[PDB]
Design a protein around this ligand. Structure first.
Ligand SMILES: Nc1ncnc2c1ncn2[C@@H]1O[C@H](COP(=O)(O)OP(=O)(O)O)[C@@H](O)[C@H]1O
Ligand SMILES: CC(C)n1c(=O)cc(N[C@@H](C)c2ccccc2)[nH]c1=O
Ligand SMILES: [Mg+2]
Lengths: 900, 50
């Protein structure tokens, strides 16, 4: 395609080549014979029908294997003309293998983005496409989903177009398991808004750096992904009424604070630690006392410490520049680096049992000395407060002696708390920058929740992240299948409810409700003598025979220490119950948090300033706040699917991909988009926006009800009338109409701005035409003047007398006429303008006389205002005096009651 | 859904049917009363032979 040239070098990695277009019309394919058949090692395989036997059919598969299956399980293949279409909602046959193979044929050619109607699927390339540099951003500016090939930039700009048109907050909702691609797409969204806002300054670069600044502190290599977001982020990009970037707000929901201290094999701790260590940058290796290699830091050495996908030498320099661009001063950047150094040393502190007190003490303190130096704390006071932390029971405080086994937990939780709040502050400081105080009204909230995960050992965090996915999956199910048809009934649309089975309310309720997991954690954390066995016991008694999704553990991998299994939407997940009570209760060492408030480092004091409310409670209320804030926004969804566990680009495992395609309800979502009415407009905004499509259908200057107006306009559009139905307050359209309406409107806006230019040039040329004619006519008069003189260069008596001045009455009396008139007219001007100026002053003095008198009256009125204000203050003070006497007697009597 | 300001950004609040009725009353009153005082101010803008 000749239009592909606009993407430059990125173009081959977004859309199929011209040869693939011509090959499609030449492929051998029979619609009646070509079908997909299920297989063991791979979910579906192409096959060829060879015979028909009534209710039983036999066919030969593409590998020459014989198969027999009943007709109820055979699905016709899509014709090659629809292969690799950019939007899977446009598939003719929609079933599990049609989506599987449609993703597989595109992904094997590195075309990683594909739409799925109202939402889009992105498949992890694992190898870069030069599809993310500055030049493509300009190609995506203002282009619509019908124009530009599928990409995360397309969704970002589409959301921006909606944000300005609807004057409503928008959302881009990226979802998927770990390693599927949500985070890199999030960055791409941020870089999109920044580059467009600068080309379409300091703030645009600052926002670009806002991602790698957080990503250094929040991302880690996992078994699923090298740069996994272990924290959910909601980034609100705010725009002014004029539409230019005005501010950006970062919000964070759940940092995997435990990851800071524990990682499984084949995964990293957060990137910040290894990127600082890898350059061995002398200024940082001097500021941070981390001159050694990363393989000795217990917290971060486990798993794998190096990954080929990340050039760890450069990421450090990228974060240093990121902080410089975001205006982090030397004290800020230095303090937060110092804090990471403290955290790194924090993992090496060793504790041992005292020979007689049965209490932990630090065996080595050099790492604590380094940490406290970096944090501006006292190493002795820190270790004393950790060794003898004080706990409170109401107002009374008592010292509890810590054992080694509980101090290791307490220090881990302390590391969690310091890291978590330092990340929060860094977020609030990024929201302190970017905030330009300029006009703000609308924002685009990009959501990148911590993905759905199945490790060999899943814990309470794995549940919180899965619950976060399950809630957004239930939100997607609700908006596409429940709320869609419910609003049809509310809007009175003649539609028949379809049950897709995509519901997770029962399993969410099993967690949220006052009998669910979270309420049990919320009460079991209160019991001082609760244990993992007491929790497991109450959990079982409450759910066995009472929950369909709660099941006995499988323990197929052995190790039956303590387990149960949960039927999430995305698969059976085995959870280990050990430690969930501690992880939820969040017992922080009150002494170390008090020292953090007392820190000599202004930053560490800021992190813990303004320090019952367990993490399950905070997360559940935060996520309900999020999803309520999100239901009040227009959502675009992005489904990230990981194609391969071995992280090999182009390699694709069909069963593992199908499992995610099933669980994210992509097939069901297409079923509703194709059958239902996904597009909807209020009759007033419809009239306001698309009146440009046919001003005669809605004549203004006369009243016409919103309903009948929309009826006439849409009837006038000459589009297929079977595509829409009318609600009580919104018009409703089939899947594919709204895009066509925006195409139609922008075609008309182009037509009109060019035709108004037809008028602008037409009358501007008229102005030029008339000015040229009048000026040249005056030039013709000037030509008559000179022609007249040559006519006068004839010899009459007058030629001698007129040119020279001897004639008395003609030259002298006309000179008197001209001189006298010159004097009179000049003074005439002066006199008329002066007389006017005197009148103008009189009119000014008359008005000033009225204003001066009214002001004289007004100063007396103001003195009355002063008397009013003074007596008001005086009576407020006297009443306060009596009110103080009242509270004096009351608080005294309350204290007397407390004494008695 | 009237817009109210919270810091530099505006937030949206949903109104009750009784309180939207009362707000439509208040809009009717304040448009009427301002229309009256403007009519007086226009009378005071004539009535002036300077
Ligand atoms: N669109 C992409 N382009 C290049 N690499 C990608 C892309 N998506 C995923 N990756 C691979 O995974 C990482 C980025 O994926 P990410 O979005 O962070 O996954 P998740 O959000 O699921 O953790 C990169 O380090 C790379 O290894
Ligand atoms: C249901 C949802 C997808 N939706 C629409 O279907 C249309 C909306 N607004 C109209 C006015 C519009 C159409 C196309 C682009 C921008 C705005 N809003 C919406 O929220
Ligand atoms: Mg991620």
């Amino acid at each position: 395609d000749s239009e592909m040239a606009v993407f430059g070098a990125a173009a081959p990695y977004l859309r199929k080549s011209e040869k693939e277009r011509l090959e499609a019309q030449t492929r051998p394919f029979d619609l009646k014979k070509d079908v997909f058949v299920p297989d063991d090692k791979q979910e579906f395989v192409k096959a060829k029908i060879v015979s028909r036997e009534g209710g039983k059919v036999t066919a030969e598969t593409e590998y020459g294997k014989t198969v027999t299956v009943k007709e109820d399980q055979v699905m016709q293949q899509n014709p090659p003309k629809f292969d690799k279409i950019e939007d899977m909602a446009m598939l003719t046959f929609l079933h599990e293998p049609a989506v599987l193979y449609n993703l597989k044929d595109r992904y094997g050619s590195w075309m990683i983005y594909t739409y799925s109607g109202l939402f889009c699927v992105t498949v992890n390339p694992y190898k870069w496409l030069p599809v993310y540099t500055p030049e493509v951003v300009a190609a995506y500016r203002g282009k619509k989903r019908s124009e530009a090939p599928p990409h995360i930039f397309s969704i970002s700009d589409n959301a921006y177009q909606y944000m300005l048109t609807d004057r409503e907050n928008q959302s881009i909702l990226i979802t998927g398991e770990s390693g599927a691609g949500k985070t890199v797409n999030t960055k791409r969204v941020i870089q999109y808004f920044a580059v467009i806002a600068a080309i379409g300054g300091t703030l645009e670069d600052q926002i670009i750096q806002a991602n790698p600044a957080l990503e250094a502190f929040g991302n880690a290599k996992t078994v699923r992904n090298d740069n996994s977001s272990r924290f959910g982020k909601f980034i609100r990009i705010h725009f002014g009424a004029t539409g230019k970037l005005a501010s950006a707000d970062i919000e964070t929901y759940l940092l995997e604070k435990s990851r800071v201290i524990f990682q499984l094999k084949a995964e990293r701790d957060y990137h910040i630690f290894y990127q600082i260590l890898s350059n061995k940058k002398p200024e940082l290796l001097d500021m941070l006392l981390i001159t050694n290699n990363p393989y000795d830091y217990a917290f971060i050495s486990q798993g794998e410490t190096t990954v080929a996908s990340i050039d760890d030498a450069e990421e450090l320099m990228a974060t240093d520049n990121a902080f410089d661009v975001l205006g982090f001063t030397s004290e800020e950047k230095n303090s937060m680096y110092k804090l990471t150094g403290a955290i790194m040393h924090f993992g090496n502190m060793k504790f041992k049992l005292k020979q007689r007190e049965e209490q932990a003490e630090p065996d080595g303190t050099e790492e604590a000395d380094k940490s406290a130096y970096l944090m501006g704390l006292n190493s002795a006071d820190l270790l004393k407060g950790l060794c003898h932390p004080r706990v409170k029971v109401g107002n009374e405080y008592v010292t509890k002696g810590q054992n080694v086994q509980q101090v290791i937990y307490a220090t881990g939780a302390l590391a969690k708390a310091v890291y978590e709040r330092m990340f929060n502050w860094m977020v609030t400081r990024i929201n302190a920058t970017l905030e330009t105080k300029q006009p703000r009204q609308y924002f685009i909230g990009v959501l990148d929740i911590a993905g759905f995960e199945i490790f060999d050992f899943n814990s309470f965090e794995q549940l919180c992240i899965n619950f976060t996915n399950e809630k957004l999956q239930q939100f997607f199910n609700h908006h596409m299948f429940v709320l869609e048809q419910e609003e049809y009934k509310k809007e009175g649309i003649e539609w028949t409810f379809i049950d897709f089975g995509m519901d997770l309310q029962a399993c969410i309720d099993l967690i949220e409700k006052p009998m669910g997991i979270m309420s049990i954690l919320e009460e079991e954390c209160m019991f001082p003598k609760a244990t993992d066995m007491t929790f497991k016991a109450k959990l079982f008694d409450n759910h066995l025979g009472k929950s369909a999704n709660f099941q006995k553990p499988r323990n197929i991998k052995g190790k039956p220490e303590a387990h149960f299994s949960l039927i999430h939407y995305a698969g059976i997940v085995d959870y280990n119950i050990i430690g969930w009570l501690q992880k939820n209760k969040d017992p922080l060492n009150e002494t170390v948090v008090g020292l953090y408030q007392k820190s000599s480092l202004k930053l560490l004091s800021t992190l813990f300033a303004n320090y019952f409310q367990t993490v399950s409670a905070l997360h559940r209320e935060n996520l309900n706040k999020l999803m309520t804030n999100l239901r009040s926004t227009h959502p675009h969804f992005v489904r990230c699917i990981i194609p391969n566990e071995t992280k090999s680009p182009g390699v694709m495992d069909n069963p593992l991909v199908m499992h995610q395609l099933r669980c994210n309800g992509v097939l069901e979502g297409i079923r509703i988009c194709r059958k239902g009415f996904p597009n909807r407009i209020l009759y007033g905004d419809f009239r306001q926006r698309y009146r440009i499509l046919n001003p005669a259908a809605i004549p203004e200057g006369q009243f016409i009800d919103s309903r009948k107006g929309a009826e006439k306009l849409l009837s006038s559009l000459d589009i297929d009338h079977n595509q829409y139905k009318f609600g009580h307050t919104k018009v409703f359209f089939k899947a594919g109409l709204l895009g066509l309406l925006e195409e139609m409107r922008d075609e008309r806006l182009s037509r009109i701005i060019t035709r108004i230019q037809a008028q602008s040039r037409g009358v501007l040329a008229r102005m030029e035409y008339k000015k040229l004619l009048e000026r040249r006519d005056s030039l013709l008069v000037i030509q008559w003047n000179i022609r007249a003189f040559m006519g006068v260069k004839n010899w009459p008596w007058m030629k001698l007398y007129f040119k020279i001045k001897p004639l008395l009455k003609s030259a002298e009396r006309e000179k008197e006429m001209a001189s006298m008139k010159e004097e009179f007219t000049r003074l005439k001007e002066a006199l008329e303008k002066s007389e006017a100026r005197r009148k103008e002053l009189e009119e000014k003095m008359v008005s000033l006389l009225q204003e001066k008198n009214d002001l004289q009256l007004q100063v007396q009125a103001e003195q009355d205002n002063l008397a009013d204000a003074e007596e008001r203050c005086d009576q407020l003070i006297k009443n306060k005096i009596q009110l103080e006497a009242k509270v004096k007697e009351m608080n005294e009597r309350l204290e007397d009651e407390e004494e008695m």
